[PDB]
Symmetry: none
Subunit: 79 residues, 10 copies
């Protein structure tokens, strides 16, 4: 066999209260908080990339080679 | 066998209260807090990359070689 | 067998209160806090990369060689 | 067998309160706090890389050779 | 067998309160605090790398040779 | 007097504010005021006897979460005039 | 007098503020005020007897979480006039 | 008098503020005020007898978390006039 | 008088502030005010007998966490006028 | 008078501030005010008997964490007028 990223919970009782819980998080972005207050912002762009925002990216890939999760704000001019 | 990144919890009782819990986090971005207050910001860009924002990237990959999670703010001019 | 990054908890009682809990964190970015107050910022860019923001990257990879988690703010001009 | 990075907790009682807990952290960035107050910042860039921000990168890799977690602010001009 | 980086806790009682806890930290960056107050900063860059920010990198690798955790602020011009 | 002016630009913003009182803002936050979380009582044998005259009595297994803003917060409150 | 001016630019911002009182802001935060978390009591044998006259009595297994803002916060409050 | 001016630029910002009172800000923080966390009591045998006259009595297993802002915070408060 | 000026630049910022009072800011911090964490009492045998007249009595196993801001904070408070 | 000027640059910043009072800031810090952590009492045999008249009595196993800001902080407070 093989186990990878497994949450296993087992509970046994005879009388009373029993709570059994499993949780798994794989490739999760949780809780991104951002505040801009009274911000002055001035941009001049000529053929380039300017990124000033909020980007929250989550990616879970099985059997994937060469995966790019986030490519933000770039200039690609390959030949 | 093989176990990798496993949360195993086992509980047994006869009377009373029983709590059993498993949790797993794999490739998780949690709690990114950012404040910009009264920030003055001036950018001139000519063919380049300027990144001043918030980027939160989480990636979980199985069986993936050459994976790039985040490529932020770059100039790629390969030949 | 083989165990790698395993959280195992086992509890047994007869009467009363029993709490059993397992937790695992693998490739986790947690709690990134950033404040910019009254910051003046001036950038001139010509064909280069300027990164002044917040980047929080988490990557968990199984069976992946040559993985790059974060490549931030660079100039790549290979031949 | 083999154990690597394992948290094992075992508890046994007959009466009363029993708490059993396991925790594992592998490749975790936790608690990055940054404040810039009244900072003046001026940059001129021509074909280079300037990085002045916050970068928090966590990487957990199994079976991965040649892995780079963070490559921040560089110029690569190989031939 | 073999044990590497294992936290094992075992507790046994008959009556009363019992607490059993295991914790493991492997490749963890925890608690990076940085303050810049009233800092004046001026940079001119021509084809080089200037890094003045906060970089917090954590890497846990199993079965990985030649791994680089952080490569920050460099010029690579190999042939 | 508070004046702001922007003359002869391409893009121009002019903001002027006499007084300003900012408020409260919770962004991505979590508050817990008066919360009871995860209480577990196990009592194999319980006998309660109460003889009350004009008063306030609370017995047994009590899990009370209160959030009182502009008044008294009590469990048992026996006031007499 | 408070003046701001931006003349002859491409992009120009002019901000002027007489008075300013900033407020409170919680960003990605967590507050806990008056919280009871994870209480476990095990009592195999319990007998409670209460003889009350004009008063306030609280017995047993109590898990109380209170958040009182502008008043008294009590468990048992016996006030008499 | 407070003056700011930016003449003849490409990008120009002009900020002027007479008075300024900054506020409080929690960013990615955690507060705990009046919190009871993880209490475990084991009592195989318990007998409580209360004879109260005009007063305040609290007995047993008490887990109390209080957050009082502008008033008295008590467990048992017996005030008489 | 407070003056700031930026003439003949490419990028120019002009900030002028008469008075300034900065505030408090918690960034990535943790506060604990009035917290009871991890109390474990084991009592095989417990008998409580209370005879109260006009007073305040607290007995038993008490885990109290209080955060009082602008008032008295007590466990047992017996005030008389 | 407070003046700042930047003439004939490529990048120019001009900051001028009359008065300035900086505040408090906790960055990545941890505070503990009035905290009870890890108390363990084992009492095989306990008998409590209380006879109170107009006073304040606290007995038993007490774990109290208090944070009082602008008032008295007590366990037992018996004030009389």
């Amino acid at each position: 066999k093989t186990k990878q990223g497994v949450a296993e919970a087992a509970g046994k009782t005879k009388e009373g209260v029993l709570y059994v819980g499993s949780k798994t998080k794989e490739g999760v972005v949780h809780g991104v908080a951002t505040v801009a207050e009274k911000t002055k912002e001035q941009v001049t762009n000529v053929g380039g990339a300017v990124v000033t925002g909020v980007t929250a990216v989550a990616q879970k890939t099985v059997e994937g080679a060469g995966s790019i999760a986030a490519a933000t704000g770039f200039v690609k001019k390959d030949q």
